[PDB]
């Protein structure tokens, strides 16, 4: 229907029309502007300052938690061995503690006689690195990640390894850095993420013959301390990320609720898990990005004059651009903070996906009120342990509550859109009229609608705004009516 499709348009120009005209009026009022701008500065700092009710914080915590669970289901069943340089070896034997292992709280790197490297086992060098991240990881979640605002946080992590059987040598002076393999130390500063960190390591041999030598053989164990380890947002998502793209770039031989495939490389049978994990981090990485754009443009200053002249929006909204950064930059956030929920939610994967993270990456096989974050035990693996199924509920219920600031982020974008770009709104507004204005004349027998929109000149504005614009509310009542019934 001709008639229909035209007040159906026709009640949408009149909205508009209508919304426009009162952001032209919001933009020249500094008492609005100024309410606007401080509901600004406290949405920043919730999203930057609060935790759990941020989804600024709950999205790069997800992520974070995404990338050590993926590790403590898959670990246990890939394949890691050989000597230093990745090269192939006969009988080394090297253990990693405090990890996701089969029956045990270390994994054992004992693939000998094939030498590491894509679809075949993981070098040492190879899990030296992903253990590092992996340890930094889960001290810093056991005590908590600190509030986006929080970027200048340190931890101190600790762990160790040991090297068994004949010639293995991955623990030896030349590797480590340690002037002595049987009892000796090297301190120097490390670079993590841009931070000079202070790294101690410590070599020593226990005798196959030592007092509470259980073991039967000798072995080195090594060592090593990180202290002042950077623990912001930006530096734990760069360890998550080295932690998957090391999985990644390895790609490395496995065997093994049960996988999909028992028999394979990780970076195939897990191909969309990394795709996903990948992409939260990324996402997260430039979440934590837009923090210094909300930083650098503080909403705290009351703008307007403050002697006696009128505000023009010409000329003294020198301010906006910086408010329409902010504002956008929160936008973006947000929006951010979503895409990594939707990434790992469960209600809307299907197929194998679905299944490996419900049934595997989400759950904790840890005894318990359950176990705190960081916690490995020797029932960890092939589970998570990384609250993700909580993390995507918390994740969900904050953005969800962070309506009200989501409506206040949109008010404050508008208005400074408006007030960067004015003159252009502003004209807007009268094409929009003059729009309106056409299709009224086009509705038959509508001689008493066509004062639906008027207007009036005021050449006295101080401040600059010639034209006054009206909406006949009687007019548009009726328009809205004849619209309802087609």
Same mark, same amino acid.
């Given at each position: 229907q001709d008639l229909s499709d035209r007040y159906e348009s026709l009640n949408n120009l009149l909205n508009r029309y209508s919304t426009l005209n009162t952001l032209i009026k919001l933009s020249a009022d500094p008492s609005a502007i100024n309410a606007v701008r401080e509901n600004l500065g406290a949405s920043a700092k919730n999203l930057i300052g609060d935790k759990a009710n941020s989804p600024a914080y709950q999205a790069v915590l997800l992520a974070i938690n995404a990338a050590v669970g993926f590790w403590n289901v898959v670990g246990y069943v890939t394949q890691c061995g050989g000597n230093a340089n990745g090269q192939k070896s006969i009988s080394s034997k090297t253990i990693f503690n405090n990890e996701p292992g089969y029956r045990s709280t270390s994994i054992t790197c004992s693939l000998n006689g094939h030498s590491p490297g894509y679809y075949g086992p993981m070098s040492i060098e190879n899990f030296k690195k992903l253990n590092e991240a992996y340890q930094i990881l889960q001290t810093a979640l056991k005590r908590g990640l600190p509030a986006l605002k929080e970027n200048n946080g340190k931890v101190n992590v600790t762990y160790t390894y040991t090297c068994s059987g004949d010639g293995n040598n991955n623990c030896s002076s030349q590797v480590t850095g340690v002037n002595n393999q049987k009892d000796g130390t090297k301190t120097k500063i490390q670079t993590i993420d841009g931070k000079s960190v202070t790294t101690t390591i410590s070599s020593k041999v226990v005798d196959s013959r030592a007092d509470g030598n259980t073991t039967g053989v000798s072995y080195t164990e090594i060592t090593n301390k990180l202290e002042g380890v950077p623990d912001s947002a930006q530096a734990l998502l760069a360890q998550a990320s080295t932690l998957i793209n090391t999985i990644n770039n390895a790609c490395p031989y496995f065997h093994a609720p049960k996988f999909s495939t028992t028999t394979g490389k990780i970076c195939g049978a897990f191909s969309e898990e990394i795709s996903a994990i990948q992409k939260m981090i990324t996402d997260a990485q430039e979440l934590v990005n837009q923090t210094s754009v909300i930083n650098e443009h503080e909403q705290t200053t009351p703008v307007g &004059?403050? &002697?006696?002249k009128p505000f023009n929006p010409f000329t003294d909204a020198s301010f906006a651009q910086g408010m329409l950064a902010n504002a956008s930059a929160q936008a973006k956030m947000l929006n951010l903070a979503e895409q990594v929920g939707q990434a790992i939610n469960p209600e809307r994967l299907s197929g194998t996906f679905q299944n490996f993270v419900k049934?595997?990456? *989400?759950? +904790?096989?840890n005894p318990s009120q359950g176990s705190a974050p960081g916690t490995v035990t020797t029932?960890?693996? *092939?589970?998570? +342990? *990384?609250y993700v199924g909580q993390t995507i509920t918390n994740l969900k219920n904050s953005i969800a509550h962070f309506g009200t600031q989501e409506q206040q982020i949109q008010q404050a974008e508008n208005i400074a859109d408006t007030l960067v770009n004015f003159k252009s709104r502003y004209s807007e507004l009268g094409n929009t009229y003059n729009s309106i204005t056409t299709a009224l004349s086009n509705i038959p027998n509508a001689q008493s609608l066509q004062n639906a929109v008027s207007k009036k000149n005021n050449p006295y504005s101080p401040q600059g705004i010639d034209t006054n614009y009206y909406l006949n509310q009687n007019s548009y009542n009726q328009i809205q009516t004849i619209n309802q019934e087609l």
């Open positions: &004059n403050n &002697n006696g049934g595997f990456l *989400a759950t +904790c096989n029932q960890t693996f *092939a589970s998570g +342990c *990384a």
